[PDB]
Coordinates of all heavy atoms in Angstrom, one line a residue:
Chain E
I316 N -18.9 -8.7 -10.1 CA -19.1 -7.3 -10.4 C -20.0 -7.1 -11.6 O -20.9 -6.3 -11.6 CB -17.8 -6.5 -10.5 CG1 -17.1 -6.5 -9.1 CG2 -18.0 -5.1 -11.0 CD1 -15.6 -6.3 -9.3
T317 N -19.7 -7.9 -12.7 CA -20.4 -7.7 -14.0 C -21.8 -8.2 -14.0 O -22.2 -9.1 -13.2 CB -19.5 -8.3 -15.1 OG1 -19.2 -9.6 -14.8 CG2 -18.3 -7.5 -15.3
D318 N -22.6 -7.7 -15.0 CA -24.0 -8.1 -15.2 C -24.1 -9.4 -15.9 O -25.2 -10.0 -15.9 CB -24.7 -7.0 -15.9 CG -25.0 -5.8 -15.0 OD1 -25.4 -6.0 -13.9 OD2 -24.7 -4.7 -15.5
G319 N -23.1 -9.9 -16.6 CA -23.1 -11.2 -17.3 C -21.7 -11.6 -17.7 O -20.8 -10.8 -17.7
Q320 N -21.6 -12.9 -18.1 CA -20.4 -13.4 -18.5 C -20.5 -14.2 -19.8 O -21.5 -15.0 -19.9 CB -19.8 -14.3 -17.4 CG -19.5 -13.6 -16.1 CD -20.7 -13.5 -15.2 OE1 -21.5 -14.5 -15.0 NE2 -20.9 -12.4 -14.6
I321 N -19.6 -14.0 -20.7 CA -19.5 -14.8 -21.9 C -18.2 -15.7 -21.8 O -17.1 -15.1 -21.7 CB -19.4 -13.9 -23.2 CG1 -20.7 -13.1 -23.3 CG2 -19.1 -14.8 -24.4 CD1 -20.5 -11.9 -24.2
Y322 N -18.4 -17.0 -21.7 CA -17.3 -17.9 -21.5 C -16.8 -18.4 -22.8 O -17.6 -18.9 -23.7 CB -17.7 -19.1 -20.6 CG -17.9 -18.7 -19.1 CD1 -19.1 -18.2 -18.7 CD2 -16.9 -19.0 -18.2 CE1 -19.3 -17.9 -17.3 CE2 -17.1 -18.7 -16.9 CZ -18.2 -18.1 -16.5 OH -18.4 -17.8 -15.1
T323 N -15.5 -18.4 -23.0 CA -14.9 -19.0 -24.2 C -14.2 -20.3 -23.7 O -13.4 -20.3 -22.8 CB -13.9 -18.1 -24.8 OG1 -12.8 -17.9 -24.0 CG2 -14.5 -16.8 -25.2
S324 N -14.5 -21.4 -24.4 CA -14.0 -22.7 -24.0 C -12.9 -23.2 -25.0 O -13.0 -23.0 -26.2 CB -15.2 -23.7 -24.0 OG -14.7 -25.0 -23.7
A325 N -11.9 -23.8 -24.4 CA -10.8 -24.4 -25.2 C -11.3 -25.8 -25.9 O -10.9 -26.1 -27.0 CB -9.6 -24.7 -24.4
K326 N -12.1 -26.5 -25.2 CA -12.7 -27.7 -25.7 C -13.5 -27.4 -27.0 O -13.4 -28.2 -28.0 CB -13.5 -28.5 -24.7 CG -13.9 -29.9 -25.1 CD -14.7 -30.6 -24.0 CE -14.0 -31.9 -23.6 NZ -14.7 -32.7 -22.6
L327 N -14.3 -26.4 -26.9 CA -15.1 -26.0 -28.1 C -14.2 -25.5 -29.2 O -14.5 -25.7 -30.4 CB -16.2 -25.0 -27.7 CG -17.2 -25.4 -26.7 CD1 -18.4 -24.5 -26.7 CD2 -17.7 -26.8 -26.9
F328 N -13.1 -24.8 -28.9 CA -12.2 -24.4 -29.9 C -11.6 -25.6 -30.6 O -11.4 -25.6 -31.8 CB -11.1 -23.6 -29.2 CG -10.4 -22.6 -30.2 CD1 -11.1 -21.4 -30.5 CD2 -9.2 -22.8 -30.8 CE1 -10.5 -20.5 -31.4 CE2 -8.6 -22.0 -31.6 CZ -9.3 -20.8 -31.9
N329 N -11.2 -26.7 -29.8 CA -10.7 -27.9 -30.4 C -11.7 -28.6 -31.3 O -11.4 -29.1 -32.4 CB -10.2 -28.8 -29.3 CG -9.0 -28.3 -28.6 OD1 -8.2 -27.5 -29.2 ND2 -8.7 -28.8 -27.4
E330 N -13.0 -28.6 -30.8 CA -14.1 -29.2 -31.6 C -14.3 -28.6 -32.9 O -15.0 -29.1 -33.8 CB -15.4 -29.3 -30.8 CG -15.3 -30.2 -29.6 CD -16.6 -30.3 -28.9 OE1 -17.7 -30.0 -29.5 OE2 -16.7 -30.6 -27.7
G331 N -13.8 -27.4 -33.2 CA -14.0 -26.6 -34.4 C -15.0 -25.5 -34.3 O -15.3 -24.9 -35.4
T332 N -15.6 -25.2 -33.2 CA -16.5 -24.1 -33.0 C -15.8 -22.8 -33.1 O -14.8 -22.6 -32.5 CB -17.3 -24.2 -31.7 OG1 -17.7 -25.6 -31.5 CG2 -18.4 -23.3 -31.7
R333 N -16.4 -21.9 -33.9 CA -15.9 -20.5 -34.1 C -17.1 -19.5 -34.1 O -17.8 -19.6 -35.1 CB -15.0 -20.4 -35.3 CG -13.8 -21.3 -35.4 CD -12.7 -20.9 -34.6 NE -11.5 -21.7 -34.8 CZ -11.3 -22.9 -34.3 NH1 -12.2 -23.5 -33.4 NH2 -10.2 -23.6 -34.5
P334 N -17.2 -18.6 -33.1 CA -16.4 -18.6 -31.9 C -16.8 -19.6 -30.9 O -17.9 -20.1 -30.9 CB -16.7 -17.2 -31.4 CG -18.1 -16.9 -31.9 CD -18.2 -17.6 -33.2
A335 N -15.8 -20.0 -30.1 CA -16.0 -21.1 -29.1 C -16.6 -20.6 -27.8 O -16.0 -20.6 -26.8 CB -14.7 -21.8 -28.9
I336 N -17.8 -20.1 -28.0 CA -18.6 -19.6 -26.8 C -19.4 -20.7 -26.1 O -20.1 -21.4 -26.8 CB -19.5 -18.4 -27.3 CG1 -18.7 -17.2 -27.6 CG2 -20.6 -18.1 -26.2 CD1 -19.5 -16.1 -28.3
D337 N -19.2 -20.8 -24.8 CA -19.9 -21.8 -24.0 C -21.3 -21.2 -23.7 O -21.4 -20.4 -22.8 CB -19.1 -22.2 -22.8 CG -19.3 -23.6 -22.4 OD1 -20.4 -24.2 -22.5 OD2 -18.3 -24.3 -22.0
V338 N -22.3 -21.7 -24.4 CA -23.7 -21.2 -24.1 C -24.2 -21.7 -22.8 O -24.8 -21.0 -22.0 CB -24.6 -21.7 -25.2 CG1 -26.0 -21.3 -24.9 CG2 -24.2 -21.0 -26.6
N339 N -23.8 -23.0 -22.4 CA -24.4 -23.5 -21.2 C -23.8 -22.8 -19.9 O -24.4 -22.9 -18.9 CB -24.0 -25.0 -21.1 CG -24.9 -25.8 -22.0 OD1 -26.1 -26.1 -21.7 ND2 -24.4 -26.2 -23.2
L340 N -22.6 -22.2 -20.0 CA -22.0 -21.5 -18.9 C -22.3 -20.0 -18.9 O -22.3 -19.4 -17.8 CB -20.5 -21.8 -18.9 CG -20.0 -23.1 -18.2 CD1 -18.5 -23.2 -18.2 CD2 -20.5 -23.1 -16.7
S341 N -22.5 -19.4 -20.1 CA -22.6 -18.0 -20.2 C -24.0 -17.6 -19.7 O -25.0 -18.3 -19.8 CB -22.5 -17.5 -21.6 OG -21.2 -18.0 -22.2
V342 N -24.1 -16.4 -19.1 CA -25.3 -15.9 -18.5 C -25.5 -14.4 -18.9 O -24.5 -13.7 -19.0 CB -25.3 -16.0 -17.0 CG1 -24.1 -15.1 -16.4 CG2 -26.6 -15.5 -16.4
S343 N -26.7 -14.0 -19.0 CA -27.0 -12.6 -19.3 C -28.2 -12.3 -18.4 O -29.3 -12.6 -18.8 CB -27.3 -12.3 -20.7 OG -27.6 -10.9 -20.9
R344 N -28.0 -11.6 -17.3 CA -29.1 -11.3 -16.4 C -30.2 -10.4 -17.1 O -31.3 -10.6 -16.7 CB -28.6 -10.6 -15.2 CG -27.9 -11.6 -14.2 CD -27.5 -10.9 -12.9 NE -26.9 -11.8 -11.9 CZ -25.6 -12.0 -11.8 NH1 -24.8 -11.4 -12.6 NH2 -25.2 -12.9 -10.9
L345 N -29.8 -9.6 -18.0 CA -30.7 -8.7 -18.6 C -31.8 -9.4 -19.4 O -33.0 -9.2 -19.2 CB -30.0 -7.6 -19.5 CG -29.6 -6.4 -18.7 CD1 -28.9 -5.4 -19.7 CD2 -30.8 -5.7 -18.1
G346 N -31.4 -10.3 -20.3 CA -32.4 -11.0 -21.1 C -33.1 -10.2 -22.1 O -32.6 -9.2 -22.5
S347 N -34.3 -10.7 -22.5 CA -35.1 -10.0 -23.5 C -35.3 -8.5 -23.2 O -35.7 -7.8 -24.1 CB -36.5 -10.7 -23.6 OG -36.3 -12.1 -23.8
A348 N -35.0 -8.1 -22.0 CA -35.1 -6.6 -21.7 C -34.1 -5.9 -22.5 O -34.2 -4.7 -22.8 CB -34.9 -6.4 -20.2
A349 N -33.0 -6.5 -22.9 CA -31.9 -5.9 -23.7 C -32.0 -6.2 -25.2 O -31.1 -5.9 -25.9 CB -30.5 -6.4 -23.2
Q350 N -33.2 -6.7 -25.6 CA -33.4 -7.1 -27.0 C -34.6 -6.3 -27.5 O -35.4 -5.8 -26.8 CB -33.8 -8.6 -27.1 CG -32.6 -9.5 -27.4 CD -32.9 -10.9 -27.2 OE1 -33.9 -11.3 -26.6 NE2 -32.1 -11.8 -27.8
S351 N -34.6 -6.1 -28.8 CA -35.7 -5.5 -29.5 C -36.9 -6.5 -29.5 O -36.7 -7.7 -29.3 CB -35.4 -5.1 -30.9 OG -35.2 -6.2 -31.8
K352 N -38.1 -6.0 -29.8 CA -39.3 -6.8 -29.7 C -39.2 -7.9 -30.8 O -39.5 -9.0 -30.5 CB -40.5 -6.0 -29.9 CG -41.0 -5.3 -28.6 CD -40.3 -4.0 -28.3 CE -40.6 -2.9 -29.3 NZ -40.0 -1.6 -28.9
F353 N -38.8 -7.5 -32.0 CA -38.7 -8.5 -33.1 C -37.6 -9.6 -32.7 O -37.9 -10.8 -33.0 CB -38.3 -7.8 -34.4 CG -38.2 -8.8 -35.6 CD1 -39.2 -9.7 -35.8 CD2 -37.1 -8.7 -36.4 CE1 -39.1 -10.5 -36.9 CE2 -37.0 -9.6 -37.4 CZ -38.0 -10.5 -37.7
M354 N -36.5 -9.2 -32.2 CA -35.4 -10.1 -31.8 C -35.9 -11.0 -30.7 O -35.6 -12.2 -30.7 CB -34.2 -9.4 -31.5 CG -33.0 -10.3 -31.0 SD -32.8 -11.7 -32.1 CE -31.3 -11.2 -33.0
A355 N -36.6 -10.4 -29.7 CA -37.2 -11.2 -28.6 C -38.1 -12.3 -29.1 O -38.2 -13.4 -28.7 CB -37.8 -10.3 -27.6
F356 N -39.0 -11.9 -30.1 CA -39.9 -12.8 -30.7 C -39.2 -13.9 -31.5 O -39.6 -15.1 -31.5 CB -41.0 -12.1 -31.5 CG -41.8 -13.0 -32.4 CD1 -42.6 -14.0 -31.9 CD2 -41.7 -12.8 -33.8 CE1 -43.3 -14.8 -32.8 CE2 -42.4 -13.6 -34.6 CZ -43.2 -14.6 -34.1
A357 N -38.1 -13.5 -32.1 CA -37.4 -14.5 -33.0 C -36.7 -15.5 -32.2 O -36.4 -16.6 -32.7 CB -36.5 -13.7 -33.9
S358 N -36.2 -15.2 -31.0 CA -35.4 -16.1 -30.2 C -36.0 -16.5 -28.9 O -35.3 -16.5 -27.9 CB -34.0 -15.4 -30.0 OG -34.2 -14.2 -29.2
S359 N -37.2 -16.9 -29.0 CA -38.0 -17.3 -27.7 C -37.4 -18.4 -27.0 O -37.0 -18.4 -25.8 CB -39.4 -17.5 -28.0 OG -40.1 -16.3 -28.3
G360 N -37.2 -19.6 -27.7 CA -36.8 -20.8 -27.0 C -35.5 -21.4 -27.6 O -35.4 -22.7 -27.7
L361 N -34.5 -20.6 -27.9 CA -33.3 -21.2 -28.5 C -32.4 -21.9 -27.5 O -31.8 -22.9 -27.8 CB -32.5 -20.1 -29.2 CG -33.2 -19.4 -30.4 CD1 -32.4 -18.4 -31.1 CD2 -33.7 -20.5 -31.4
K362 N -32.3 -21.3 -26.3 CA -31.4 -21.8 -25.2 C -31.9 -23.2 -24.8 O -31.1 -24.1 -24.6 CB -31.4 -20.9 -24.0 CG -30.4 -21.3 -23.0 CD -29.6 -20.1 -22.5 CE -28.4 -20.4 -21.7 NZ -27.5 -19.3 -21.4
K363 N -33.2 -23.4 -24.7 CA -33.7 -24.7 -24.3 C -33.4 -25.8 -25.4 O -33.0 -26.9 -25.1 CB -35.3 -24.7 -24.1 CG -35.9 -25.9 -23.6 CD -37.3 -25.7 -23.0 CE -37.9 -27.0 -22.6 NZ -39.3 -26.8 -22.0
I364 N -33.6 -25.4 -26.7 CA -33.3 -26.3 -27.8 C -31.8 -26.7 -27.7 O -31.4 -27.8 -27.9 CB -33.7 -25.7 -29.1 CG1 -35.2 -25.5 -29.1 CG2 -33.3 -26.6 -30.3 CD1 -36.0 -26.7 -28.7
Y365 N -30.9 -25.7 -27.5 CA -29.5 -26.0 -27.5 C -29.1 -26.9 -26.3 O -28.3 -27.8 -26.5 CB -28.7 -24.7 -27.4 CG -27.3 -24.8 -27.8 CD1 -26.9 -25.3 -29.0 CD2 -26.2 -24.4 -27.0 CE1 -25.6 -25.5 -29.4 CE2 -24.9 -24.5 -27.3 CZ -24.6 -25.1 -28.6 OH -23.3 -25.2 -28.9
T366 N -29.8 -26.6 -25.2 CA -29.5 -27.5 -24.0 C -29.9 -28.9 -24.3 O -29.1 -29.9 -24.0 CB -30.2 -26.9 -22.8 OG1 -29.5 -25.7 -22.4 CG2 -30.1 -27.9 -21.6

Side-chain angles (χ1 to χ4, degrees):
Chain E
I316 294 156
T317 48
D318 288 312
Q320 297 87 42
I321 296 160
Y322 286 83
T323 65
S324 179
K326 189 176 238 184
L327 300 196
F328 208 79
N329 290 339
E330 289 184 24
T332 312
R333 305 280 187 281
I336 286 171
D337 214 321
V338 174
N339 286 281
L340 275 180
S341 307
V342 62
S343 182
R344 285 186 174 90
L345 273 179
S347 311
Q350 269 168 339
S351 72
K352 276 81 70 175
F353 181 50
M354 179 47 105
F356 166 61
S358 62
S359 284
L361 296 183
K362 189 136 192 172
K363 184 165 179 180
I364 296 312
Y365 199 54
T366 289

